[PDB]
């Protein structure tokens, strides 16, 4: 059934699985019209489809043209997400198809189940985890490729860069979730922590700074501190 704190190790076993997050598919700026009414203007979005074991990110860019002349866009977005995920599974060779797809939001369950009726062996699962994948658009190179897209586009990334050379997928996923939780809670503070020390660069083929093992411990520490402080301010605790 639901993916939760209890069954957390299952993410790193040898059954191919994908997380699907739809939080950045349908994105709008709300503005005033000349007549003093409110209107939305869509901007480019993305489906965040992630193999938590390998770090492979299938970033499907949702170009604003998708929404042209369509009604009930927040509902369409869920079905569009399901159509793209099902297109992605059908495009993969059988031995690369996921055995499970975990949706970060329960509203994605029916749209994905209906789009995946051809795949009765692929389990569609919710999670009890509050995953910070919404902060994917706080990663500069992901934000950049989305905003520049002039048409629908699939871009392939490894969201772990080269970390799996040195750490396990459990540790790589905990680092990713810590970075994304920080970026989500206080984006300015989190980005300051990551890009202050100028000697440290992001390689052309990477998303995150090239940190030595010791520099990662220091960064991780600064991210936790950022997250706990903002929790204090939040709940006056």
């Amino acid at each position: 059934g639901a993916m939760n704190s209890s069954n957390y190790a299952e993410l790193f076993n040898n059954d191919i699985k994908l997380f699907v997050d739809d939080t950045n598919v349908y994105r709008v700026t709300v503005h005033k019209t000349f007549e003093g009414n409110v209107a939305t203007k869509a901007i480019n979005g993305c489906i965040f489809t992630l193999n938590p074991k390998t770090g492979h990110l299938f970033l499907k860019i949702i170009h604003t043209s998708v929404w042209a002349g369509q009604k009930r866009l927040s509902q369409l977005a869920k079905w569009k997400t399901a159509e793209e995920v099902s297109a992605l599974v059908r495009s993969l060779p059988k031995e690369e198809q996921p055995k499970q797809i975990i949706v970060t939001r329960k509203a994605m369950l029916d749209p994905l189940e209906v789009h995946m009726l051809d795949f009765p062996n692929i389990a569609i699962r919710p999670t009890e985890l509050r995953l910070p994948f919404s902060a994917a658009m706080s990663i500069d190179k992901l934000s950049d490729v989305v905003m520049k897209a002039t048409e629908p586009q699939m871009v392939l990334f490894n969201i772990y860069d080269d970390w799996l050379d040195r750490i396990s997928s459990y540790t790589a996923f905990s680092r990713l979730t810590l970075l994304l939780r920080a970026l989500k809670t206080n984006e300015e503070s989190a980005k300051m922590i990551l890009l202050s020390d100028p000697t440290i660069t992001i390689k052309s083929y990477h998303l995150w700074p090239s940190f030595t093992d010791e520099q990662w411990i220091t960064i991780e520490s600064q991210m936790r501190d950022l997250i706990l402080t903002e929790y204090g301010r939040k709940y006056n605790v």
């Binding site: 509902q75 079905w79 399901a82 159509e83 029916d110 749209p111 189940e113 789009h115 009726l117 051809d118």
Partner: protein, 300 residues
Amino acid sequence: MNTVPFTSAPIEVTIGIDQYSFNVKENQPFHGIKDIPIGHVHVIHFQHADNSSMRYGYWFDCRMGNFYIQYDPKDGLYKMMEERDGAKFENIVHNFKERQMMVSYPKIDEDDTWYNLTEFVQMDKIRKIVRKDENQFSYVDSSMTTVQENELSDPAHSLNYTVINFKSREAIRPGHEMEDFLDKSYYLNTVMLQGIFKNSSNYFGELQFAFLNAMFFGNYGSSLQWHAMIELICSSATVPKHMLDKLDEILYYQIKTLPEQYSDILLNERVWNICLYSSFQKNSLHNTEKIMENKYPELL
């Protein structure tokens, strides 16, 4: 005016005939039910005084043969049987009527309740849902499972209701996923009405039969089927206007007849709230919405 004579009543039992029922004592001189209106299906049903788990009965049509009830002390139930000897049957019924040992089907002349609940129900469709081809009458009880329920364990004793599944390839055209899931008109009109039922009369008959099996036997699978067939119409944007008019009448009489003390287990909150207040047809069931609001406001 036909008759279902009884050999005897050797065990104390509540006997149902359609929407009526009476208590018979162990070895009470009871020899059956007379003045049964011709032209409709009927159901005779049984709840033993000792074991209210024995809840079961027979769908029958008196035009199709001469039916009687005899208690079987081996299988421990009241059994429907057909008497092929027309003259022996008339002779037995004449005696029992002369000795006034038969209760009279207690129909009020003004009262169209049974017609209204069974308008579309036909014995030939019942016998395809309940397969026992050697009999002209159909046994149902509280425990019988549906073909659909058994897919999720004895095929011979199953209720063969039409499988409805909103998250099935049958229900969803490839490339029409959101459209067909959010608007079930294609599934209702093309797959079910044109494809499987052939017409709305057969659809309504199955819906009405599912309700009656739910109400008279507390058959859970029948109740699932009744709600599924309501929900498939209500979740369709495009329904013939006569079907909507007729559905409103059907549901009105079902809700009218339901015992007040069973609405908690026989009515699905989600389906009714969706059908009356959210669905495409939320404004198409005036009679049904008014009786539900006045009779079961807590449910909604």
